[PDB]
Design a protein around this ligand. Structure first.
Ligand SMILES: CC(C)S(=O)(=O)NC[C@H](C)c1ccc(-c2ccc([C@@H](C)CNS(=O)(=O)C(C)C)cc2)cc1
Ligand SMILES: C=C(C)[C@H]1CN[C@H](C(=O)O)[C@H]1CC(=O)O
Lengths: 51, 85, 51, 51, 51, 85
């Protein structure tokens, strides 16, 4: 974003998340990818059949 | 009848230009509109691509208000790119 | 075998399957973005479906 | 679980740049043509090492 | 779209899908909702199996 | 590096003609050969179609031995058809 504002780069192509604060200073293209904040953990062992 | 390439391009550029002429002074806004009309009248091998894609892009980025004639005259020779996808 | 018939899954699991079978008719709105998406689409499955 | 919020990535361009509208229209065309989807499937899933 | 272009309306708020054809004539805000073309059928019924 | 349409067509006809000039009296036989080479040199959006298909067909149907010049002069303005299919 900084490189864009201060004219050190003409365009930015990267997983750059669209935010209001960034949309105020720069221009965002229509989103090319959809995402969201999600939770990652370590896959558990099989719980076993049990009785 | 039969469809061409060169004919489609020359028609495309001319129809776009003639279209943008009605919108003089607001011209930089309506390039995509006039390109749409031109693609309709001149036809296109791929509806998304349009008659000439490269000319459209060049015009869109170059065109400034009232600068139309020079912009078109500069952009009308440009390569249209692949009229497939 | 009957209880496996109850356990049977996936009558239609994807858009492609509709293209693969003529038994189930399917459609979209008389106009709007969906129909036009199918019309203008050059990718195989959706094309077939449009036809 | 699901996602906490729903947002998207995007191509960033300086305000008042000549590249902005062309880039945006490009993202749209790529979106409808399915290029973006095919690309994600290429990089994420198709070579996927799990299962 | 027409009411907007011909200046009978200042703004359009409705489930209006973003398409390239529409993005060319009018201007679209960043998407406030995400969707996609999907398939709808009649859910089967397992009720009242009987003796 | 876009290949446009018109540039590719004029290139196609020019290369086909220039190639067929090398074979005198056999002109009607080598049309497909020279079209192959011309498609190679000028490139094509669909390798099967070639640079200009309609021009190829026109030449093949028109061209007779020693009739090259007139046949080409007649066939070079023809519509190329769909370059993607
Ligand atoms: C029409 C296409 C060009 S597209 O939809 O823009 N891009 C296709 C791509 C797969 C895609 C599709 C949809 C979305 C998407 C993501 C989020 C939302 C809502 C929930 C919030 N929109 S927003 O832009 O992130 C926000 C900051 C307001 C709405 C749509 C993001 C990316
Ligand atoms: C509900 C309707 C008729 C609208 C809503 N979105 C699509 C649109 O933006 O045209 C249309 C539905 C569709 O095309 O499946």
């Amino acid at each position: 974003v900084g490189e864009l504002v201060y004219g050190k780069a003409d365009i930015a192509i990267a997983p750059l998340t669209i935010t209001l604060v960034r949309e105020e200073v720069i221009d965002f293209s229509k989103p090319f990818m959809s995402l969201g904040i999600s939770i990652m953990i370590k896959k558990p062992q099989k719980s076993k059949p049990g009785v | 009848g039969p469809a061409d390439c060169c004919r489609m391009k020359e028609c495309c550029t001319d129809r776009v230009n003639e279209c943008l002429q009605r919108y003089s002074g607001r011209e930089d806004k309506f390039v995509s509109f006039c390109y749409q009309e031109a693609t309709v009248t001149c036809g296109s091998f791929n509806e998304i691509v349009g008659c000439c894609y490269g000319y459209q892009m060049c015009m869109i980025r170059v065109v400034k208000p009232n600068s139309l004639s020079g912009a078109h005259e500069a952009c009308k020779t440009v390569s249209c790119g692949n009229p497939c996808a | 075998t009957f209880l496996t018939v109850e356990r049977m899954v996936s009558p239609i699991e994807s858009a492609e399957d509709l293209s693969k079978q003529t038994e189930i008719a399917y459609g979209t709105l008389d106009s709007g973005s969906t129909k036009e998406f199918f019309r203008r689409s050059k990718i195989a499955v959706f094309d077939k479906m449009w036809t | 679980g699901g996602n906490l919020d729903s947002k998207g990535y995007g191509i960033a361009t300086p305000k008042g740049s000549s590249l902005g509208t062309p880039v945006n229209l490009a993202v749209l065309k790529l979106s409808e043509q399915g290029v973006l989807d095919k690309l994600k499937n290429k990089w994420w899933y198709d070579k996927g090492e799990c299962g």
